[PDB]
Assembly symmetry: D2
Homo-oligomer: 494 residues x 4
C-alpha cells in the first residue's frame, strides 16, 4: 500500500554535518531550498564553501588514520552498520519519501515505492559485500610469498545531482563505506534535505565520527573545493558531462586523485519489426518519460523499423496524452514539475529547436499551469540525426522518434554519439538480441525491456557517459586500492 504523504513538514536538519555534529557555515551564509511544484521556500540551509569542505576533509582523513575505530573494526561490523542504516531508512520511509517528493518535484508514490525501496535494497546489497572484499595470494616467480590487500582508497569526495537525491546519496556512500572508506558528500544545491536527514541516521546507526561528512552548497564553490582538494584521494561524480570534464581536469591539476564519473546520455532504443509492439511501446514510453524525463538513461532516441514506424508513432502519441500534471503529492497526479527554472528554460529551448529544425510536433510542446515548472509531455516524430533534439540531452518530457531500414545503419546511427550510457533493443530474434547488444557502444543494454537497474548489476557509461562502474561486484572493487606485499622466504612450495 502507499500511505498518504505528510504535509506541513517541519524541517530539522539544515546544517553542515562534520564529525557527527551539525555546524553553521564558516561564512554564516545560508541558501534557500524550494518546492518546484509550488515555487515556495521549504527552508534555508547552511551554505558550505571551501572553508567548510576543508573541515570536512580533515574529519574524514582523521577517521581514516591507521588505528582509528573505522580502520580497525571488523569488516563484518561495517556490514552490520550499513544494515542498521537501512533499518532506519525503513523506519523513516514515509518522512523521507514525502521530503523527497516536496524538494525534488518527484511523484510521491514513486518516491515511496521506487526511490525509497531502491535506497533500502542498495544498502542491503552493500552491507553484504563488506566482509567479502578479498585480495589474493599469488604464485610469483622466485622464493617469495606474495599477497595483495584490497585496501580502501581513503578519503572519497562524492558530488551528486538533484534527480534522485537520496538514491544517489546511498549509491555513493553504500559502496564506499562497505569497502572501508570515509567520505565527504556534496548534495545538489537544489536538493540537500534528504541527505541532511541521512546525517542524523548515520549518527544514530553508530558510524564513527568523520566516516560520513555532508557539505551542502553550490557547485563551483563546495564541489570544486572537493575536486581540487590536495587531500582527497578519490572523487566520484554524477551529473552533467560539462561538469565531469571540469572535475577530471581539476583532479589532474591538483593531486591526481582517482576519478569516477557517471554522466548522462542520449540512449538509443531500437525497435525491430519483429518485436512485440505492445511491450515495446510501453517500455520505450516509460524509458523516456520517467520522472519528467530527468533520468540519465532516458530513451531519447527511439529508432523504429520503417514497416512499423507509423503505427509506433501513433501509439506513442496516444500514450503521451494520458497524464495529469500537478503537485506530485496530490493523489491522481501522474506528472510533476521539472526541478528548476534553468532546466525548464533548457527544455523549452530544445523544444523550440525541434520545431525550427523541422521535426514533426505530435503533441505537447509548451508549458502548463501558472506556478511551478511544468512542461506538457511532448512527442516529436520524423526526427533526423543532425537535429539538436537528436544530439543533446534534453532532460525533460520530450520523446524523439526516428525511422530506420537497415540493421547495419541503425547500429551505426545508435553509436554515432559521444554518449554511451545505455541502450535498448526490442526483437524476437535470438541472433539480433546477442549480436546487436555486443555491437552497441553502451554500458547497459536492455533486451525487450528498459530502465531495469538493480544493485547486483554494474552500472555506468562508455565514452563520455562515464568512467568506471557503480554497484555490482565490479563497482565495489573500485572503492579499493590494491597493495602488493612480497616477502622473501628461504624456499617456496606450491
Amino acid at each position: 500500500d502507499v500511505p498518504a504523504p505528510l504535509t506541513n513538514l517541519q524541517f530539522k536538519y539544515t546544517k553542515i554535518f562534520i564529525n557527527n555534529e551539525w555546524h553553521s557555515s564558516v561564512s554564516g551564509k545560508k541558501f534557500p531550498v524550494f518546492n518546484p511544484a509550488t515555487e515556495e521556500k521549504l527552508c534555508e540551509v547552511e551554505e558550505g564553501d571551501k572553508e567548510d569542505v576543508d573541515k570536512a576533509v580533515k574529519a574524514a582523513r582523521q577517521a581514516f588514520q591507521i588505528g582509528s575505530p573505522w580502520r580497525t573494526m571488523d569488516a563484518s561490523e561495517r556490514g552490520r552498520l550499513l544494515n542498521k542504516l537501512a533499518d532506519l531508512i525503513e523506519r523513516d520511509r514515509l518522512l523521507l519519501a514525502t521530503m523527497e517528493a516536496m524538494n525534488g518535484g518527484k511523484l510521491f508514490s514513486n518516491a515511496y515505492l521506487m526511490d525509497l525501496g531502491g535506497c533500502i535494497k542498495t544498502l542491503r546489497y552493500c552491507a553484504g559485500w563488506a566482509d567479502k572484499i578479498q585480495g589474493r595470494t599469488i604464485p610469483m616467480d622466485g622464493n617469495f610469498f606474495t599477497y595483495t590487500r584490497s585496501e580502501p582508497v581513503g578519503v572519497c569526495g562524492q558530488i551528486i545531482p538533484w534527480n534522485f537525491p537520496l538514491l544517489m546519496f546511498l549509491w555513493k556512500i553504500g559502496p564506499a563505506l562497505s569497502c572501508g572508506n570515509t567520505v565527504v558528500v556534496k548534495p545538489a544545491e537544489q536538493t540537500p534535505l534528504t541527505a541532511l536527514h541521512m546525517g542524523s541516521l548515520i549518527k544514530e546507526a553508530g558510524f564513527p565520527p568523520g566516516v560520513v561528512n555532508i557539505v551542502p552548497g553550490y557547485g563551483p564553490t563546495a564541489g570544486a573545493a572537493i575536486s581540487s582538494h590536495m587531500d582527497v584521494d578519490k572523487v566520484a561524480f554524477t551529473g552533467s558531462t560539462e561538469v565531469g570534464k571540469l572535475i577530471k581536469e581539476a583532479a589532474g591539476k591538483s593531486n591526481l586523485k582517482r576519478v569516477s564519473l557517471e554522466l548522462g546520455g542520449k540512449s538509443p532504443c531500437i525497435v525491430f519489426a519483429d518485436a512485440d509492439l505492445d511491450n515495446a511501446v510501453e517500455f520505450a514510453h516509460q524509458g523516456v518519460f520517467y520522472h519528467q524525463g530527468q533520468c540519465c538513461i532516458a530513451a531519447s532516441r527511439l529508432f523504429v523499423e520503417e514497416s512499423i514506424y507509423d503505427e509506433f508513432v501513433r501509439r506513442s502519441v496516444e500514450r503521451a496524452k494520458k497524464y495529469v500534471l500537478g503537485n506530485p503529492l496530490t493523489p491522481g497526479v501522474s506528472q510533476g514539475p521539472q526541478i528548476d527554472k534553468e532546466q525548464y528554460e533548457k527544455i523549452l529551448d530544445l523544444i523550440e529547436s525541434g520545431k525550427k529544425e523541422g521535426a514533426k510536433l505530435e503533441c505537447g510542446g509548451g508549458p502548463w499551469g501558472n506556478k511551478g515548472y511544468f512542461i506538457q509531455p511532448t512527442v516529436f516524430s520524423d526526427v533526423t540525426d543532425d537535429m539538436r533534439i537528436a544530439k543533446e540531452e534534453i532532460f525533460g518530457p520530450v520523446q524523439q522518434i526516428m525511422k530506420f531500414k537497415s540493421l547495419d545503419d541503425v547500429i551505426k546511427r545508435a553509436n554515432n554519439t559521444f554518449y554511451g550510457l545505455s541502450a535498448g533493443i526490442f526483437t524476437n530474434d535470438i541472433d539480433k538480441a546477442i549480436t546487436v547488444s555486443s555491437a552497441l557502444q553502451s554500458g547497459t543494454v536492455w533486451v525487450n525491456c528498459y530502465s531495469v537497474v538493480s544493485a547486483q548489476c554494474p552500472f555506468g557509461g562508455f565514452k563520455m557517459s562515464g568512467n568506471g562502474r557503480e554497484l555490482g561486484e565490479y563497482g565495489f572493487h573500485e572503492y579499493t586500492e590494491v597493495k602488493t606485499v612480497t616477502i622473501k622466504i628461504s624456499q617456496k612450495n606450491s
Copy 2:
C-alpha cells in the same frame, strides 16, 4: 651464459609504424638518436607529430571495428599470437639487448638477462590471460537474465619512458592486446629503436594491421596529440609526475578518456635494528643504484634505526665504492651513463642542494669521465626530511640515509610524501612485517627484499605515484570495459 654483445649495429627500422607498414613522417622531419655513453649519433628516426598520430588512431580504430579480424578472432588465438611474439623476441634476443644497451646507456649483461628475460616472461603471462578474461551472470532482482561482457576498452594510447624502453613497451602492449584492444604507442624520444624493431616482429607474428601502431617523436607533439585525441578511448602513461598531471588534464578537457598512470616515487626503505643486516645492506643498495638510479621504485629514502645507523652507513658507503664506470657494452664495466644531458644536470643540481643544505657527503658527489653523462655513485647521510634530496625524485645514483628511533614516527615520515609507489621493510619481527606493511601508503611493499617485480603481481602507485595497476590479474581488468546486458524473460529460476 651471456654472449658477447654485437658492435657496429646496422639500423633498419627507423620509420613510423601504422597498419603494419613503415611510413615517413607527414612533415618529412627526422630526429637524431644517440648513444649516451659516447654521445655519438646511432641513427635518425622519423619525427612523428599530431598528423602522424591521427593516422595511427584512424588505423587502430578501423582494426577495432565490429566484424574486423581482431574483434572476431578467438581469444585463444590472441594468446597464440602473443606467445609467437615472445618466441621472436627470444630469437632476436642478442640484437634487442645490444640495441637496448647502446641506445639506453644500460649495462649489457643486465639488458640481456633481466630486461629481455622480463620482456619474454611478460608476454608469456599476458598470452595466458587472453581466453580467461570473463564476465559474469548475475542473479538480479525480477524476471530477467543478466550477464556482463568484459569487452576491450578500444583504442589505447600508450606513452612510455626511456629507462626500460623495451620492457615498458611490452608491459603496455601485452595486457592491452591480451584483452583485445588496439594501440597507438609513443616511445620516448631518447629510446625509440627497440620499439621500432618490435614493429617488424609484430608484423612477422601475424597480428592484423592496425592492432599495434608506433609513433616515435617528442612529448608535447606526438604524446600530447594522443592525450588530447577525441578518438582515443584510453591513455596509459609511464613517466614523470609532472607530465602525468598534463595527461590527466588533457583527458578531462577532451573526450573523458580513461586514464592510467605510473609516475615515479620517493620510496622509503625501513631497516629495523632486529633486521638481518647483510641482507638489508645489499637489497637497499641495489634498490637505489640499479640502472644508474633510473628506476621508479628507487629506495631513495633509507631509514635506519638509531642503534644500527652508523654501521649501516659505513657498510653502505663501502658498498657504493665498488663500481667501474664506462661504456656499458664493455666487459668489466658495472655502471653506465645517465640517459641524457637534462637528467645529468638535474642530478648534479640535486647533489649540490644536498651539500648546501647540510647533508653529509660520504662518497662521490661529482661527474666522471670526458665523454658521456657519467656521475660518481653518491651517498649522503644525516639526511633530514625537509631537504630537496629527501623530497624530490633524483633518478640518479644518489643514496640518502636517515635515522629514526620510533616505529610510529618512521611510519609517519615514510608516508609524509605525495609519492606512494613502493617501500621496503627489513625486520625479523612477524608483527612488524604484517602491521608495518599494512600501514605504509605504497603500492608494493617488500619485506626482507626489494625490487622484486613479477608479471603475476599487480604494480602501481598510491597517491601521486599513479592511478591503476599494471600486470597481474588486476591489471588486466584495467584493459576491459564492462557491459551489462539484461534480458526480459517470462520467469527466472535460480
Copy 3:
C-alpha cells in the same frame, strides 16, 4: 553481560518438521533426550526413520521444482530471509543458549556468548552471499555465446553431530539456503532440541514449506536413509571418520550424490623455542580443553622443542588444575560433562591406554562426581608417536605433550597421520611461520594462535579429516552445480 540462564524449561518442539508442519513419526516411536550433567530426561522426541526421511525428501524436492516460490524468488530475498532468521535467533538467544547448555552439557556462558554469537554471525555472512553467487561469460572458440549458471545443487541431506548442535545446524542450512538449495537435516540423536526450535523460527521467518525439513532420530536409521536415498542430490556430514566412510560408500552405491565431509582430527600444535611462551601455553591449553575436549580441531598432539619442553609441561599441568567441574548452568562451573556414556567410556579407555603404554600421567586421569559424565582434566607428558593417545581422536579433556629437536623431524611427525584438519605453529621467526605453514598437511594452520574460526574463512580437512570446505567464499561455491550454456550466433566479437 551474560544473563542468568532459564531453569524449568518447558519443551514445545518435539516433532518431525516437514513442509513447515510438525508430524509424528510414521512408526509412532519416540526417543528420550537427556541432560548429560544430571542424567535426567528432558523430554521425548519423535523418532524419525526411513519412512520419515522419504516424506522429508519428497517435500524438499517439491520445494525445489522449477517455478516454485523458492526457485523463483529473488536471490536478494533469500538473503533477507536469512537475516530475518538471524534476528529471531537474537530474540530467542537466551532460550536457545539455555537449551543448548542443558541438552549439550555445554558451559552456559560459552553457549550464550560463543555458540549463539557464532550462529548469528554465520547467518549474517550467509545472507550477504545470496545475490552475489555469480556465473561467467566465457570467450570460447568459435561463433558462440557461452555463459554459466551457478545453480543450486538441489536436495541436500545434512547430518550433524552433538558437540555444537545449533552452530552446526546453521553452518549447514545457511550456505545451502543462501545458494538456493532445499534441505533435509538430521540432528544428532543426543541433541535434537535446538534444531527443532529452529524449525519454528524458519516457519516464522517466512521460508516456503519444504525448504528446510528436520528429521530427528538415530544414525543407521534416519542418517543412513539420507545417505542412500535415490533422490537426494548431495549429502553433507560432520562427525566421525568411521561414519564418513559409510556415507561416501552409500553415496557410491546409490545415486552418486555429491559428498562433503568434515571429520575430526588429531591436530598438531608445534611450539618452537623462539615462541612467546605465555601466549603459546594458553592457546594450546584452550585448544585442547575447549568444550571438554569435544572439538574437531583439538590440539591433541602438542609438540614442544626440547629446550623449553620441561617448562612447557610444568606450566601446562599447572593450567589444567584450575577447573571447577559441575552443572554447566551453575555460575562458577568452568568444566561440564562429556555428552554421553559412550564418549565417557571411550575417553576413560584411552586414558587407561596412556598409563599402560608408559605416558607420564601428570594430573587427572579419572572420573569425577556421582552423577553425569564427568572426567578430570588430564595431562600426559613423554608421549610418543606410537601410543594410542598420540594416534586416536580422544574427544575428551586429555592433553598429550611430546618433545622434538629437529624442524624437519617435527614436520614429518606432525604430518604422519591420516588426519589433516588443523594445526598450530608458535614461533617468532617469519620464515618458519610461512614455510612451516606451507609444509603442514592441514586444512587450517594457525600462527601464534589457535581455534580462530570465522564465517569469512573456508574450513575443512586434508586427507581423512574431510572432503570440501565449509563457509567463506569457497564453501559457498560448493552448494552450487555449474551449468554451461552455449548458444550459436552468426558472428562473435570480443
Copy 4:
C-alpha cells in the same frame, strides 16, 4: 590440409612409465592390443597390476614432497613445460593421429583435425592457468591476518576410457599438472598406445621424474588398485556409470580420497516447431552419430514437436543413409568400427530390444562386413520413454526419435532420467532458449547447436552423469586443496 596417414607403424613405447623410465610389468605378463577395423594385433603392452600401481604411486608421492623440483618450481615454469609438451604433440601430430585411428577405430581425418587439434588446444589453455591459480586474503573478524593457499591436491589417480584416448589423457594431466599435482594414469586396456607415446614426450619436455606415471592394464586390476590405494589423494575417472559407482565406493572404503567422475549420458535434444530445421537436422544427426556413436554427449533422445515430427524423421533417415563403412585409415570411408566385441554385442542387443519393444526401424539395424566390429547406422522412430533404447546408453550408431506436444511435458520427459550430462534445444524463441536451458537438468546445454566443447568451458554432469567439472576456470579449482592460514597480529587495519 590432411596429410596421408602412416601405414605399417613400428611400435616403440609398450612399457609401464614410472619416474621417467620404462619398466616391465612386475609379473612379466603382457596383453595384446588390437586394431578394431581389422581384428589384427598391433602389439603387446606390459600388463600393469596392483604392484605396478604401487610403484607408480610411490614415484608420484616422492615427486610431490615439499622441497622437490616439482613443488619448488615457479608456477610459470609449469606453464612453460606444458606449452613445450603441446609443441611436441604438434611435431608428432601425424604419428599420434595415425596411431589413434589404428588403435581406436577412429576416422583418420577426425583424429588428425579434431582429436589432435583439441589435444594441443587443451594443453595451451592449461599452460596459461598455471601461474594464475591464486588464493585469497580475507578480512576475518578479530586481530588476525588470514590468507589462503590454493595448493595442489597431491597424488592424483586418473582412469580414462577408449573413445577419445589421447584427448582424455590430456584433459586429465593438463589441469592436474597446471595446478602442481603429480599423477598416475591408467589408460583403457583397449587403447594404451598414444598414452605410452606421450610418456616419451613428457620426458623429452623436461617434466621431473614421477610427475606423470602411466600404468597400462585392465580395470579391476590396475584401475581398482588406484581407486582403493591408501596413498592416492584424489581419483578422477571417465567411463561407465557402473564403474563410477565402484570408484566412489572404493574411495569411501579406503582413504576418503577426493573423487571426480564423468560418466556418460542419455542426452535429450529438443527441436521445437519454430526451429531452423536444416540446422537442427544436421546438428542432431552429428550429435548422435559422431565417432560411431561412442560419445558421452550423444544426442540419443531426439524429441521433435508433433507438427514437424514426420518431416524431421524423414530428413534424419535420409541423412543416416549417407555413409561408407570401412577401415578408418582408407580415404572415402566415413564410418569406422565399434571399439571391440563387448560394445558390438551390447549395441546389437539394444537394437534387438528396440524391434521387440515396438519402435519403428527406419534404417540399418544390423551388422556389416566380414571383419571388424561394424554396425549399420540405425534410426528408430515412434520411440517411447519406457523402451530400453530410450533409457540405456547405447554407445553405438543408433538414433532414437520421439514426438512431443507440450513444452511442460517435454521438459519433464527430458529430465526423467538418472543421467544429466548434456542437452540441446533448437528454437528461434528467445524466451524458450533461456528458460528451457535453465529448466533442463544437464551440465551443458547447447542452443541451436550441439557437441560444441572448448577448453575454456567447464564440462561435466548433473546427477549420475558425473561429480565435478573439468576444464574452464571451475575445473582447475578442482585440482586444488584450500589451506587457510591465520596469523595473530597486534592490530588489524582495513
